[PDB]
Each structure stands twice: as structure tokens, then as C-alpha cells.
Enzyme design. Structure first.
Site, PDB file in Angstrom:
ATOM      1  CB  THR B 155      -1.011   0.057   1.233  1.00 29.29           C
ATOM      2  OG1 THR B 155      -1.868  -0.993   1.124  1.00 29.29           O
ATOM      3  CG2 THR B 155      -1.734   1.420   1.189  1.00 29.29           C
ATOM      4  CB  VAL B 184     -14.080  -0.564   1.495  1.00 29.63           C
ATOM      5  CG1 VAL B 184     -13.567   0.815   1.049  1.00 29.63           C
ATOM      6  CG2 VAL B 184     -14.932  -0.948  -0.009  1.00 29.63           C
ATOM      7  CB  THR B 206       0.748   2.235   5.324  1.00 30.76           C
ATOM      8  OG1 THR B 206       0.921   1.103   4.798  1.00 30.76           O
ATOM      9  CG2 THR B 206       2.162   2.679   6.088  1.00 30.76           C
ATOM     10  CG  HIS B 208      -5.327  -4.402  10.613  1.00 26.18           C
ATOM     11  ND1 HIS B 208      -6.055  -4.511  12.050  1.00 26.18           N
ATOM     12  CD2 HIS B 208      -5.890  -5.150   9.856  1.00 26.18           C
ATOM     13  CE1 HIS B 208      -7.134  -5.368  11.568  1.00 26.18           C
ATOM     14  NE2 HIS B 208      -6.640  -5.817  10.404  1.00 26.18           N
TER      15      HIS B 208
HETATM   16  N1  LIG Z   1      -4.336  -0.154   5.051  1.00 32.80           N
HETATM   17  C1  LIG Z   1      -4.420  -1.283   3.854  1.00 32.80           C
HETATM   18  C2  LIG Z   1      -3.188  -2.211   3.836  1.00 32.80           C
HETATM   19  C3  LIG Z   1      -1.775  -1.563   3.885  1.00 32.80           C
HETATM   20  O1  LIG Z   1      -1.590  -0.486   4.274  1.00 32.80           O
HETATM   21  O2  LIG Z   1      -0.923  -2.621   3.440  1.00 32.80           O
HETATM   22  C4  LIG Z   1      -5.554  -1.851   3.691  1.00 32.80           C
HETATM   23  O3  LIG Z   1      -6.096  -2.377   4.795  1.00 32.80           O
HETATM   24  O4  LIG Z   1      -6.508  -1.571   2.896  1.00 32.80           O
END
Ligand SMILES: N[C@@H](CC(=O)O)C(=O)O
Ligand SMILES: N[C@@H](CC(=O)O)C(=O)O
Ligand code: NA
Ligand code: NA
Lengths: 298, 295
Positions: B155, B184, B206, B208
Site C-alpha cells: 500500500t 473496503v 498505512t 491494518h
Molecule cells: N491499509 C491497507 C493495507 C496496507 O496499508 O498495506 C488496507 O488495509 O487496505
């Protein structure tokens, strides 16, 4: 142990005719009654807020579930979110179709998945897996909403609830059909935590309504809770948060709030906001500025 | 006027493989230099974060655009958002399929619609109407991602301050391996996966997804900055709260309206890079930063 309270709102809208006003009154009183009926038996804030929003979803007089406004293509697409202030547990669905009660789907997302937010085709498939009935779309469509769309081509009635339960938990629920003649797949504030609502046992709970784009841009619900954190009363916080939305992004709307200590208010910058509150065996109700009445619950 | 800056992140993560580190490094460099280049042309903060994220979308190494993780049906479903700190204009898309650049479509939502957020089939219809190419689902799927999904079935973002003092953020993701269809996360949700406000600063997050939503991490961070915290203190309180309240790990990048910036994280790693005053700053592991000149 705290006195339970529930607050419910319809839609942060413009002027309402005398006729619609009384229909709006019955449905709001019903929803407050369902939600408080839950709390008075020792039910959870989550259960109460879900109960109230289901009552409004089911009532055609309100822009959620049956009676949801129509999108550009004459279809009902609904959003809803729910949140538990204890652990910040949350569920939400957006652009959901062919179901009676999006708020109950939002609830199943919270408790039955490792996720908080399901959309569209995925929300449809999850509902199917959880046994939620798939109903024909015309059941959600009303003549009133056909007329509103057809005209708009040539905002109102959105619903929400907050509650404080006897165990000291807080919760919110919000659900909507969105805004009439919205684009296919338009998501509003209602399923977005911090915007459509926020609930936290350590501050309080908020549910919002009005121009969703503005609400999302300012994070209206969590912003109101920020003001409470800084020491503002619930009314001062609502005033300031709604005040900011008007100044910064030119959006109007309304909110209901209950604080961790049981304080509560309804405040709006729109013309009207149907609202009801139940506490101490009394029902509070209004639509316009200080048209408020208080009446006894049985 | 302000000295411009771009900060980019390539996602909070567990331990990252040694060989991967090199290609991540190069990716972070290409995105930041793209962002900073636009700023050097006197371009806007929104142009800068969009271009920075576009590069990472196109880079198969990063979980966004090409190279997105796969959902439980082995398919790519993408989330993105972008925000203009001047008037808080914003655009977001969730659960989009078969397009190269979700961040570009999020910008179209901001610029060409009266709305801020489109999803799934609506977003696909809007894409076609804007004349966005439909690209085969398989072309977004990488071998390692096909093999990541098998192991489970058994991400990116950017912030910028521009030469007129405007801030922006952009964030793009494929989400989490094995996710339910239509899940989502935080990335497209204003105030969670990011926020931008000229009066405070801009954040992209970024980690969880669900945790980031629950604590509204981007907005929380800026709240601390409003209260007089340094960007570093603010990042540590908000990440610290996510950890202690919802047991979530993640990371963030933030630039204030004064041009102070920071990349912090409670995950093990977070590739990040920042360009300011002709120099490039890069890291993946904490207490381990490299500074090079930037032509
Ligand atoms: N925040 C992203 C995951 C990530 O940051 O890698 C999601 O859960 O959609
Ligand atoms: N907030 C709702 C509309 C309303 O509350 O009137 C939406 O934008 O979806
Ligand atoms: Na209804
Ligand atoms: Na990529």
C-alpha cells in the site's frame, strides 16, 4: 449505573409541509420508542441504535431502506454504518441494493467478518451468505421518490441514532439512500467512520446528516467529539463543528450527540431536522428551532 | 513562498526480504523524484502526490495498481483517495477493477463530479465515461501475488507541500491478501487513510485497514499538530493510541504547513522517501536512513 438515553434523527433538510410533519412525527416517536424499549430492558447501546434505525428504514417516510431516494438511473442504493464505543467495533456497507435493512447488514459486517466496510457486489454476496433476503427493488421504491427524481432531472429524510446504555456504553447508527439523482455508485458520509458517525465510550457518540460531501470533508462526527475532548459542552461542540462545516466548505447539516456522562443535544444549520430523544421516561421531539415538546413515555 | 517537499511511503510491513529491499529502494526513489520534479516545475501539491502514487501503482513491486494483492477470488479490487488541503476538495474510489491507475480516477472524481467517493460498478461506469482504458484483470496480477494467495488459502501514498504553501495527500492500495469480495479499507476513506488541510498539514497512512478506520488515524495525527505537538510527537501519539486502543500497527507520513515532515511506524518496516532542498532521504528500517543528493 447510568440512566439510558437514545436520540434519533431524520434528515437535515429544508422546509417541511404541515402534512409530512405529522407523518414524520409518528415515525420518529416510533423509532425513539423502539430504541428506548431496548435500553429499558437492559439492552446494549448497539442493539438500541440498530433497533431505532430499523424502525426508520422500514418506514416509507424516511430516506433509508424503503423510501430511499433514487439514484440517476431510478434505483435505490443504500449506505449504513454502526459503531460500538467500547472497543470501537464497527461495520458499514455502501451502495447496497435489494435488501430491506442495510443497518442490519452493517451490523453483520461488524460481528461476522474480520472487516469493517463492505461495498456493492461484495456486500450483496455477504448478505446472501448470511441469509438476508434479496427483495425486488420496486418494494424499496415509492411514488413520492419517483416524482422527486423525475423533477430533479428537469437533502432530506436520512436517519440515525445514538445511545448511552445502563452499562455505560455508547453507540451510533446511520443509514441512507443518499441524495436524489446521485451518480451510480456515489458513496456519501453515512458509511464512513468519523463522518457519518463516531462512538467512543471515553467521549460520546455522534450521528450526522446533511450534505454528505461536506460532512466527509470535515469529518464532522469525529470533529464534534474533538471539541468535547477539549472540554466544550455538547451544544458548544455541535455549534463549533457545524459552524466549521458552514465556513470552510459551505455545507449545512445537523447532528445528534450523547456524551459519556449522559448530556445530549440535537443541533442543525439546515432549515429543519426531525429529532426525538428519550430519557428519564420523557420523550423530547422537534423539527424546527425550539418547536420542541416534552411528553411522557408510558 | 515555501520550500516544497514530497514524502512517499511504500506500505507498512513485516520483515522485508533482502532481494526485495533493493527493488523497493529503487521504487521509492523513482516515485519521490517524480513527485519532487513536478514540485520543481512549480506544480501543485495535488499534481505531485498524484504523480508519485501513479509511479508506485505502475511498479509491480508495490501493493497498488499493477502488483495489488489478491482477494479471496484471486482478483484485484483497488482503493484510492486524494485530497486538496486548500478547500478540502477530495476524490476517492473503492473496489475498482481492471484499471491501471485508481489514483488518477480518484482525481477525476474530485475534479469532474459533484461527489467525493464512487464505488465498484459506479466507479467502473464513471471510468469508461472518462475514457479510462479497461485493462485485463490478469495484467494487474503478479506471480508472487498468485503465490501469496495460495499460502493464505492453505500500500502506497504520498504527501506534499507546494511552492504556494498548499498541501495534499494521495494513497492507493490493493488491500489485504485474501480479503472478502468488496472489502473496503482505510485507504479511500477521508480522515483515515489520509487527510489534507492547509491550516495544519497532510498525512497518508498505512497498516491494518480496519484499525486505521476505527481510530481515524490521519485526522487524529493532525489533531495533535493543532494542539502544538511536533509532527514526530503527533505521529507517535496517534500510532501509540492505535496500538493501545485497537491493537493495530501501521505507519504514516506527514508534512506540516511549516514544512516539517516525518515518516514513523509501529509495523516492523515501512519503505519511505522524502525530497526537500535538493536532497533525497530514504529508509525502510528504523534508525537507518540514507541521504543522497538529488539533481
Ligand atoms: N491499509 C491497507 C493495507 C496496507 O496499508 O498495506 C488496507 O488495509 O487496505
Ligand atoms: N448525509 C447523506 C444525506 C443526508 O444526510 O441528507 C448523504 O450524503 O448520503
Ligand atoms: Na425508510
Ligand atoms: Na504497483
Amino acid at each position: 449505573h447510568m440512566n439510558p438515553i437514545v436520540v434519533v434523527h431524520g434528515g437535515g433538510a429544508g422546509p417541511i409541509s404541515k402534512d409530512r410533519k405529522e407523518r414524520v412525527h409518528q415515525g420518529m416517536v416510533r423509532a425513539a420508542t423502539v430504541g428506548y424499549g431496548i435500553l429499558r430492558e437492559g439492552g446494549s447501546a448497539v442493539d438500541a441504535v440498530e433497533g431505532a434505525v430499523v424502525a426508520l428504514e422500514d418506514d416509507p417516510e424516511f430516506n433509508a431502506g424503503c423510501g430511499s431516494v433514487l439514484n440517476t438511473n431510478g434505483e435505490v442504493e443504500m449506505d449504513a454504518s454502526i459503531m460500538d464505543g467500547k472497543d470501537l467495533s464497527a461495520g458499514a456497507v455502501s451502495a447496497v441494493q435489494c435488501i430491506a435493512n442495510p443497518i442490519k447488514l452493517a451490523r453483520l459486517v461488524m460481528e461476522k467478518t474480520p472487516h469493517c466496510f463492505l461495498t456493492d457486489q461484495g456486500a450483496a454476496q455477504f448478505a446472501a451468505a448470511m441469509g438476508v433476503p434479496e427483495i425486488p427493488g420496486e418494494k424499496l421504491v415509492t411514488e413520492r421518490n419517483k416524482k422527486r427524481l423525475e423533477k430533479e432531472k428537469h437533502n432530506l429524510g436520512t436517519v440515525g441514532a445514538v445511545a448511552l446504555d445502563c452499562k455505560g456504553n455508547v453507540a451510533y447508527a446511520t443509514s441512507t439512500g443518499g441524495i436524489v439523482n446521485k451518480m451510480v455508485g456515489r458513496v456519501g458520509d453515512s458509511p464512513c467512520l468519523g463522518a457519518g458517525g463516531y462512538a467512543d465510550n471515553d467521549i460520546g457518540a455522534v450521528s450526522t446528516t446533511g450534505h454528505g460531501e461536506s460532512i466527509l470533508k470535515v469529518n464532522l462526527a469525529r470533529l464534534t467529539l474533538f471539541h468535547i475532548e477539549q472540554g466544550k459542552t455538547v451544544e458548544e461542540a455541535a455549534d463549533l463543528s457545524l459552524g466549521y462545516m458552514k465556513s470552510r466548505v459551505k455545507g449545512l447539516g445537523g447532528l445528534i450527540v450523547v456524551s459519556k456522562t449522559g448530556d445530549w443535544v440535537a443541533k442543525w444549520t439546515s432549515t429543519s431536522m426531525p429529532w426525538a430523544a428519550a430519557k428519564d421516561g420523557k420523550l423530547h421531539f422537534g423539527i424546527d428551532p425550539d418547536d420542541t415538546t416534552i411528553t411522557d413515555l408510558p
